């Protein structure tokens, strides 16, 4: 057996209150993983072998 | 930078929300004591000779 797993990480979230409210506090944290927070440009062209 | 500060105080404010109270109820309650004697309150008195 195996299986692929795509890791994002574990986010605590609080109940009782808003969920939308703790999203936009976790979707910065999780731009800022990705790397996309900040205007970009991908240059994965030279990324490759023959 | 800025969105999250934006999105830091709106989730301050939603997470202002009381959920309950707690208190004890003692008013009207009061202690016990326990007498261990009953009190009677009699002497006999008899003459000399008994009569």
Same mark, same amino acid.
């Given at each position: ?50 | ?11 301050? !404010? ?6 309950? #109270? ?5 008013? =009207? ?5 326990? !007498? ?6 009699? #002497? ?5 000779? =008994?009569?």
């Amino acid at each position: 057996h195996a299986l692929i797993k795509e890791d994002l990480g574990q986010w605590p979230v609080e109940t009782g209150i808003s969920l939308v409210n703790q999203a936009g506090v976790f979707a910065v944290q999780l731009a800022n993983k990705l790397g996309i927070d900040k205007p970009f440009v991908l240059d994965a062209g030279s990324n490759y072998f023959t | 930078e800025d969105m999250a500060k934006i999105y830091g105080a709106v989730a301050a !404010v939603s997470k202002n929300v009381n959920s309950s #109270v707690t208190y004890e109820v003692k008013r =009207g309650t009061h202690e016990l004591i326990k !007498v261990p004697t009953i009190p009677h309150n009699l #002497v006999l008195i008899q003459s000399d000779n =008994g009569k």
